[PDB]
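Example record

Each entry pairs one chain with its bound ligand, 8CA.
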Amino acid sequence: CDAFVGTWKLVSSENFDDYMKEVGVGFATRKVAGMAKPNMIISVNGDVITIKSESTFKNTEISFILGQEFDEVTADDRKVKSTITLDGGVLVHVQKWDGKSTTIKRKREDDKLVVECVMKGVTSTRVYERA
Ligand SMILES: O=C(O)c1cccc2c3c(n(Cc4ccccc4)c12)CCCC3
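Structure tokens for the complex follow.
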């Protein structure tokens, strides 16, 4: 996947706080993460895709091969098992930890990068446009 390549800035966000809460993020991390307006920088080198989110809150980075599970430390310090695939042009990122699971879909829509975060009954949607 490469249509995802480029530098992206968060422009809008709905229900993210509820999302973080449901995932289990403590209030302190919720406050500073909810107010963050991170840049998402996505690059690809062959089979390795790298995605960085930079913000004053925290900088994070993952690098992976489609279909290969990998260990991740999240901005909220969860140690999760992550598995990202490309499905109908949508990057589907799954995190599993403690028998729980959350799903993050990244898609390209017009000129937006759209992010859908799902946990249990909560769905948060985030939009990012080119910088
Ligand atoms: O829009 C995001 O960057 C984002 C997308 C999906 C899930 C998450 C979580 C967070 N962000 C935002 C974020 C992450 C790293 C750096 C800045 C902002 C998500 C914060 C920690 C809990 C889970």
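The radius of gyration is 14 Å.
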